[PDB]
Write a protein that binds this DNA or RNA. Structure first.
Lengths: 50, 222, 227, 40, 92
DNA sequence: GAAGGGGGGCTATAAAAGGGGGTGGGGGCGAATTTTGACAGCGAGGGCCAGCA
RNA sequence: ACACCCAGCCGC
DNA sequence: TGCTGGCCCTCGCTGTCAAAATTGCGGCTGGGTGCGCCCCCACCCCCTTTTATAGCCCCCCTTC
């Protein structure tokens, strides 16, 4: 169905975004099993230990 | 004259009643008396400018209770009644308020402590076991629920494959009761093997899609 | 390799009906789901009788080998699970009885017996035959009996096995018989019902072993016991 | 560095504000000062 | 309290799963002994005070360096004010 | 009616036959602060127009 | 034989 | 023909609010870990029956 394609491309949107930028407001943070929100590119470049 | 009417003759007579607070041991003694006829004597004495109210416990009931009056005009209190015949009535209006206190000063606390022992009876605390338990997960060849269920699968029996005419009559008779049915409900009512019943109803019944719960079957031939 | 999508912090991800529009699909194949549920069942089964985690990990190893052997699809995964638990308890030299596994499992003794028979036939392994002396420590300790009772009962059981009073008798029956020997000779005494409760053998089986072990009693005892 | 090394020695926070908060309030343009004042 | 709520939810799901099929259920297997025995262990071991956004550093390894260190570590308190925050008032 | 006893059923071993039911596998449903910046209201203004004189 | 997370502690 | 007040259509100061970022340097140590679920299909096991074998155990019977 068209709604299946829409929700799946929206999910892939979310995954590409959280690959690029994770700290942005609104969407939930992509996390591994058992906590530990994964270290995206912002978390690797910006800040003290970046 | 109606069921919801409250009799108001007591208010028209301007009957004045007294409301009094008493401690719980007096109530317990009055309950233990079980209405023998007398529980004590109420004493009142008025001086030239003061009043004195007290209550004396019955000597038989025991085997002084001074009263303190209080302000009443802060509220208007009246008493109504409900009967088993649903005839509501008003008794009267409270005109004086008092409270009952014990004359015992130091020994009374002892009774309070005993009531504490009467009130700390149902509260319950954890205990220490010197020995760890033995009778947990006792080695049993088959569970009681399991052996009862396996026993019950012997006499109810497996659903025998029946002839086509009888199951057709059963399914149309069930269709006469209600328009739609679920497959698991048809299996329960007709009491037939799922694959066989599905094979019989494939010829005459047809799946119609319903987005409200699931794709289900129709027993109508058309 | 996967990731979980958590709950949203901001309210900007919520739809008009809520539901946050972004949630974990959790596909992870069927076989991995089956293995995960089986491992959960193994852990919650072995915790009931308080097994050490080495036996749990050995059970998981046997379950993964059986599941990848692809021969026992026709039986409930829980049966293979409890069978692997029995195999791992056997292979560490601390065997449990079938009834003890059946107590902490939803499965009858017939099914676990047949599944154990099919595991030994299929996975091609050999297990050591049980002896009476393995069960003695667990039985005495759970019955709260001292060390002298332990040593006396173990000596009685091993002597009764080697001298041949009990042809073809189950080791569980003669083990509980040795428990009854050591119990009915000291200050502390244990009733037939307690012995059957802790061993799983029926009181008739205890009386059968009693009446068959009763002649030649001082020879089975150790050198000193303080009668 | 010759400005910020005389910043780790004075204290923090009938006179106007003075110290590290004044330094922070000066090098930021600080559109809402805490105690702005004139000298007429 | 939270973990007993979890245990009751779990035994409710188990009892429903073996009551919808229409038979009795054994209570011994119903209660998962994993939950209470593991979660309290996990919380005291890690110091994270929850079922993994909760309070952190509640539980610490005891400071066996001297007897005064042990006593001062056992009689310690802890404020929840965010330790990195550049405040002045609550610390006084 | 508690306890000991007897008789009988349960367990596994093979094998065949058909079909019902249990089981697993795949697929579908829903404790602190700054600056830049825009939304939205209120308000005034130049303009555009029909009517006045 | 790591990598995150957490805690404690040192000097200013 | 010049003058007048109505609203149209455009601009914008402003209050509050939303968005988004940052919040000392270096270091030594120990410790822990690594959603929510129903339905529809294939495929296999047990339902019978027989019999030998024996220990084990349920159930009823019997005793006093």
């Amino acid at each position: 169905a068209a709604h299946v394609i829409a929700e799946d491309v929206k999910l892939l949107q979310f995954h590409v975004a959280t690959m690029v930028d994770n700290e942005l407001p609104g969407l939930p943070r992509a996390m591994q099993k058992s906590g530990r929100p994964l270290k995206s590119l912002k978390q690797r470049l910006k800040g003290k230990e970046g | 004259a109606e069921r919801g009417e409250l009799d108001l003759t007591g208010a028209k007579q301007n009957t004045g009643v007294w409301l009094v607070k008493v401690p719980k041991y007096l109530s317990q003694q009055w309950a233990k008396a079980s209405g023998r006829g007398e529980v004590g004597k109420l004493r009142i004495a008025k001086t030239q400018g003061r009043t004195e109210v007290s209550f004396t416990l019955n000597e038989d009931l025991a085997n002084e209770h001074p009263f303190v009056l209080q302000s009443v005009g802060g509220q208007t209190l009246t008493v109504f009644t409900e009967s088993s015949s649903d005839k509501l009535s008003l008794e009267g209006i409270v005109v004086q308020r008092a409270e009952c206190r014990p004359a015992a000063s130091e020994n009374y606390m002892r009774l309070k402590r005993l009531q504490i022992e009467e009130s700390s009876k149902p509260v319950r605390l954890s205990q220490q076991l010197d020995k760890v338990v033995t009778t947990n997960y006792k080695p049993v060849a088959n569970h009681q629920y399991n052996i009862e269920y396996e026993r019950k699968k012997k006499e109810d029996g497996k659903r025998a494959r029946a002839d086509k005419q009888h199951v057709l009559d059963m399914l149309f008779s069930a269709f006469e009761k209600h328009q739609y049915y679920n497959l698991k409900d048809l299996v329960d009512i007709t009491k037939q093997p799922v694959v066989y019943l599905k094979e019989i109803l494939k010829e005459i019944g047809v799946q119609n899609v319903k987005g409200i719960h699931k794709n289900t079957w129709e027993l109508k031939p058309e | 390799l996967s990731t979980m999508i958590g709950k949203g912090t901001g309210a900007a991800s919520f739809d008009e009906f809520g539901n946050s529009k972004y949630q974990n699909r959790r596909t992870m194949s069927s076989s991995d789901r089956a293995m995960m549920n089986a491992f959960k069942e193994i852990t919650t089964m072995a915790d009931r009788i308080n097994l050490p985690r080495n036996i749990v990990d050995r059970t998981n190893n046997l379950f993964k080998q059986v599941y990848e052997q692809k021969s026992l699809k026709g039986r409930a995964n829980d049966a293979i699970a409890s069978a692997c638990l029995y195999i791992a308890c056997r292979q560490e030299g601390v065997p449990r009885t079938f009834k003890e596994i059946c107590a902490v499992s939803r499965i009858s003794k017939k099914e676990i017996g047949r599944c154990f028979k099919l595991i030994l036939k299929a996975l091609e392994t050999s297990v050591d035959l049980i002896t009476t002396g393995d069960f003695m420590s667990r039985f005495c300790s759970n019955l709260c009996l001292p060390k002298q009772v332990q040593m006396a009962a173990t000596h009685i059981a091993r002597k009764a096995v080697e001298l041949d009073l009990v042809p073809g008798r189950s080791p569980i029956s003669v083990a509980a018989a040795a428990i009854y020997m050591a119990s009915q000779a000291s200050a502390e005494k244990r009733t037939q019902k307690e012995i059957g409760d802790i061993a799983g053998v029926a009181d008739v089986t205890i009386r059968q072993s009693y009446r068959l072990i009763y002649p030649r009693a001082p020879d089975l005892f150790p050198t000193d016991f303080k009668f | 560095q010759s400005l910020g090394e005389p910043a780790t020695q004075m204290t923090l926070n009938k006179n106007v504000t003075l110290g590290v908060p004044r330094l922070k309030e000066l090098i930021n343009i600080s559109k809402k000062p805490k105690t702005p004042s004139l000298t007429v | 309290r939270g973990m007993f709520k979890n245990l009751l939810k779990e035994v409710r799901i188990y009892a429903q799963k073996f009551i919808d099929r229409g038979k009795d259920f054994n209570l011994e297997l119903a209660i998962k002994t994993r939950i209470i025995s593991d979660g309290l262990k996990y919380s005291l071991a890690t110091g994270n005070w929850g079922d993994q956004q909760a309070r952190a550093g509640v539980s610490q390894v005891l400071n066996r360096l001297t007897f005064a260190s042990t006593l001062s570590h056992l009689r310690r308190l802890n404020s929840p004010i965010g330790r990195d925050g550049k405040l002045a008032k609550p610390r006084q």
